[PDB]
Amino acid sequence: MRILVTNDDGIYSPGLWALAEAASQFGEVFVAAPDTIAHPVRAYPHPSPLAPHFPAYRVRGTPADCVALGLHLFGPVDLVLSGVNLGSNLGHEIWHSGTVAAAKQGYLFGLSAAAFSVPLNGEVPDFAGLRPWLLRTLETLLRLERPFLVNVNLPLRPKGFLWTRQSVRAYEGVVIPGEDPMGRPFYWFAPRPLKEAEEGTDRWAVAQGFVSATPLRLDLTDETRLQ
Amino acid sequence: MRILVTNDDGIYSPGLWALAEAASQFGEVFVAAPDAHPVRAYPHPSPAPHFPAYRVRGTPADCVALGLHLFGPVDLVLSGVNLGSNLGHEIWHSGTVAAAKQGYLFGLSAAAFSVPGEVPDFAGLRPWLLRTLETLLRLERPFLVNVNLPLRPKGFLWTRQSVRAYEGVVIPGEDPMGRPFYWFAPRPLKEAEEGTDRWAVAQGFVSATPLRLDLTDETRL
Amino acid sequence: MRILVTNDDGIYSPGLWALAEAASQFGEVFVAAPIAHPVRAYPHPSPLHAPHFPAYRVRGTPADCVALGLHLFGPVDLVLSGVNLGSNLGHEIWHSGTVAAAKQGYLFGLSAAAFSVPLNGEVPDFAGLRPWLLRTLETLLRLERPFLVNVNLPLRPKGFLWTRQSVRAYEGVVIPGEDPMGRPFYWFAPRPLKEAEEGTDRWAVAQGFVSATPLRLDLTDETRL
Amino acid sequence: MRILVTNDDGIYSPGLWALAEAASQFGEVFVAAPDITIAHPVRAYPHPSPLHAPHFPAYRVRGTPADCVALGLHLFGPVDLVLSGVNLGSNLGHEIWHSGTVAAAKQGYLFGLSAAAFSVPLNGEVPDFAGLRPWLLRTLETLLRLERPFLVNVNLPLRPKGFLWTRQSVRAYEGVVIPGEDPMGRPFYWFAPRPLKEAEEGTDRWAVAQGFVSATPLRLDLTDETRL
Amino acid sequence: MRILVTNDDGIYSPGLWALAEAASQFGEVFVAAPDITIAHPVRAYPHPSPPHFPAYRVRGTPADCVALGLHLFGPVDLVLSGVNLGSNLGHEIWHSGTVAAAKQGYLFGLSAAAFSVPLNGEVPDFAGLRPWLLRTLETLLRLERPFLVNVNLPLRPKGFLWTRQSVRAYEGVVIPGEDPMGRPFYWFAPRPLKEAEEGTDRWAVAQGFVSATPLRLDLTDETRL
């Protein structure tokens, strides 16, 4: 089977290649990652970091551009994998995720797709320590009925795996007045959730040390307040 | 990360504390060494930096199981350094190797360390241990690697297992007393080929052989 | 056709003599049962119930039995080991003594097979095992040579399957507990993640089929070398 | 009378069933043979006694000979006598100490039952039990007259021609260490300890040498009352 | 005088050197430690002792070490075995490898003493037990030779005592049970009918007294002949 790997952090992200090396254990892997209506898109052959040799291309465009391009240069493709994003994509975050966007693009092109993200801010992810779980997760995903569109989040040091629904919460827009060192005032916008994530939600699962996989939908329509 | 160290020579083998100390330069170390079954274990004081230790009245596999329960999560299982080789055909019956295989069977990276008349000078081997650990720690995980360090290494080398055919030499003999017997002195048909673990250690090179778990010969299935 | 029958359960296991008799149906059977070391061996009487077999009880390892065995009854063209009183499936092969003997034979240039059966519970009826035991040797004997196969016969075979070795991952299950005298201990009882995939020795014998797995000698993982 | 029979060679050993059939002449027999102080698990599965003599209850046991004595007394309790053997190999003089056969009997004695260990010198030619049976019966008859409880070690030559009570042979030794080398040059020492005199009359070793069955009453206490 | 020192734990046991070191305080010490009567091959290997008493690691049993010990070092005036990590009291004396080595010494014509300290919990403080090892050794070295004594040192010794082996009746406690995997088995837990008695090594060690018991070689019960 043939797999297209991309992300939105760029071609030097180690999360990209971790995902590539892990995906290669299941098929021929091809890379198309962003560099840094109709429209021209430049792309250049890129040498894969030193490990198996992955045919790669750095694309002077968006991740969605990379999937498109990738499907043309490496067509045919059976699966589009986006990530591993350096940073989580959970709950309300899924909506505007670039990592997720790329995968959603492959899905719209008729392929099966998945986004992978790990929580950041603070300690760096150990992609060496995550491989076993990327594998287990990829293996699990490949048994699903095609096509599928799944959002995956992995904890820094995972202990299991769970299918999850997206965490959905209400927030209080806490705005706290403040004075900077010079003396200029500003507002500290710091939204806090009105409640802990529920069991069964992606957010809940990563907090518990579980890998999280949420099957996504493409329709944002609220069918109940429609008819 | 978190490293569990064990062996099969026991809690007082300087080879265990030489692997443990070497492993402490890469992560936090915990030790569990031998003296659906029941097992007993007792806290034990380490010789040298302080390592949480435990002596397990059981098999080496047991130490690995019991260590993951007591110190888990663990990322790497290191077994050795064994006093005595563990090359070629010998791997099969290796206790040192069987401990690491246990860590592997549990989803963890694992490595076995051994050294072959005279005794090893660990202070002098240390450099090769560190050097060897860093190398191993750069392999995709999980992994299972068999390592043999000669007394005084002069290099490193990723090797394969030496698999030689033998001739069963049996020669009638008799003890000084008078009781007769049979000498079973098997002998390899050829010499260890280049690039195999045994040949490698013979050259004075540290040997590391990734090991598989499937004993199936698919080429005939 | 000459055959050396050995084992690791020792000279009195009914499983050993059960293998010899099934083996004799295909050639002359000989017996030997338990660095350069000295090894003692003595003549041993075969159970007069079956057509006399020259046998020796060896005071050493099963590997010794095969060595001394090819010396005393040489030439031998097939070394059979078992039938072991206990299975030898999946990860168990690695350490099996029955398998080791067959292995030794192979290292010597000969073809070889190890045979095991499930114990701990009830006892194997070798009379009601003779059909499939005989059939298994017919098959084994059709293989290109030399061969090296691990065989496992369910308590009551109803079929036969060439199989792959079962390779499973485990969860290190360690349950605390205390005995009657009050003292504490730990129960180590590892349980595998997934079930035994079909086509594996463990799946075969669980379905009710004799299992036969060709074995290799190279423990190396070339895909990582 | 009830009799528990075991050994340390295994449940398939004919030395085991010979002692069982023999004991079955004096009472009901129950067998428990192989397949640490702290409490330990021990599995035991029913075993079919060979259909060549009057079938007796039996149990294969995944433990030690002593484990056997204990499970037997439990699955067959109550028992009057614990017989262990017939061990394929001798258990004379210095050898009595680390004997698995004697050990099982000692275990029975420590539970307050009379016990005896039976052995037959091996190495070379294996025993003939049809011909030992009379000697097993004769010995057993002799033992059952003893004031109970008793603890006796019995050794029978292959072709006995008499019976004799004996004391343990106690000889001095010399550690013979002669150098040698395998057929590869490699150096090694040949070590064979050997007694410095012939065994004395009245010792177990002398008896069997002469062709007499030997029987020795045993003590539990290893304390040398002399130096104390 | 000259002394041969061994044990059954191996050449790396702290107990062994804690003994060799205390032994050197009375004569030339030589250490031979571990890795049937018919002639068997034995290999020893020069081993660096950590004072400095010549040493060997012997690919053999403890007995082998006494035999080899004398042939490569001997003649010798005394054999010491230990200190064994773990006690060797009462019924235990029967199958102690520590005692068996001193025994192999006596049977060779030399005086011998086996030393032991309880474990199953905390490790011993050898450098903190030296007081009584030297004392225990002085008392013995003055004993009329040849002698054969079994010494048991409690962890925190407050004295000494010549003893008699504690010999006791037992109850074959057998309680069924089942492992976590639901399988049945029997707990066998023997327990003595009563507590040790004054004058026995088992009672003496429980009162914190170093215990020594002279041992006989003949298991014969004369009051039955």
Curated annotation (Swiss-Prot), chain A:
InterPro entries: SurE (IPR030048), SurE-like_Pase/nucleotidase (IPR002828), SurE-like_sf (IPR036523)
Residues bound to a divalent metal cation: 8-9, 85
Record's keyword annotation contains Transport: no
Protein name per Swiss-Prot or TrEMBL: 5'-nucleotidase SurE
Cofactor detail note: Binds 1 divalent metal cation per subunit.
GO molecular function: 3'-nucleotidase activity; 5'-nucleotidase activity; exopolyphosphatase activity; metal ion binding; nucleotide binding
Location relative to the cell: Cytoplasm
Pfam families, per database record: SurE
Cofactor(s), by name: a divalent metal cation
EC assignment: 3.1.3.5
Family according to the record: Belongs to the SurE nucleotidase family.
Record keywords, A-Z: Cytoplasm, Hydrolase, Metal-binding, Nucleotide-binding, Plasmid
The keyword Metal-binding belongs to this UniProt entry's keyword annotation: yes
Function text: Nucleotidase that shows phosphatase activity on nucleoside 5'-monophosphates.
Catalysed reaction equations from the record: a ribonucleoside 5'-phosphate + H2O = a ribonucleoside + phosphate
GO cellular component, one term: cytoplasm
UniProtKB/Swiss-Prot annotation, chain D:
Keywords, in A-Z order: Cytoplasm, Hydrolase, Metal-binding, Nucleotide-binding, Plasmid
Entry GO terms, CC: cytoplasm
Superkingdom of origin organism: Bacteria
Example of a GO MF term: 3'-nucleotidase activity
Catalytic activity: a ribonucleoside 5'-phosphate + H2O = a ribonucleoside + phosphate
Binding-site positions, a divalent metal cation: 8-9, 87
Name of protein: 5'-nucleotidase SurE
The species this protein was found in: Thermus thermophilus (strain ATCC 27634 / DSM 579 / HB8)
UniProtKB/Swiss-Prot annotation, chain E:
Name of the protein in question: 5'-nucleotidase SurE
Residues reported in the UniProt entry to bind a divalent metal cation: 8-9, 84
Protein origin, superkingdom: Bacteria
Family label: Belongs to the SurE nucleotidase family.
Known EC number: 3.1.3.5
This protein's record includes keyword Transmembrane helix: no
Function: Nucleotidase that shows phosphatase activity on nucleoside 5'-monophosphates.
Gene: surE
Co-factor: note: Binds 1 divalent metal cation per subunit.
The entry's keywords: Cytoplasm, Hydrolase, Metal-binding, Nucleotide-binding, Plasmid
Entry's localization field: Cytoplasm
Phylogenetic classification of the source organism: Bacteria, Thermotogati, Deinococcota, Deinococci, Thermales
Organism: Thermus thermophilus (strain ATCC 27634 / DSM 579 / HB8)
Catalysed reaction equations from the record: a ribonucleoside 5'-phosphate + H2O = a ribonucleoside + phosphate
InterPro entries: SurE, SurE-like_Pase/nucleotidase, SurE-like_sf
Cofactor: a divalent metal cation
GO terms assigned for molecular function: 3'-nucleotidase activity; 5'-nucleotidase activity; exopolyphosphatase activity; metal ion binding; nucleotide binding
GO cellular component: cytoplasm
Pfam families: SurE (PF01975)
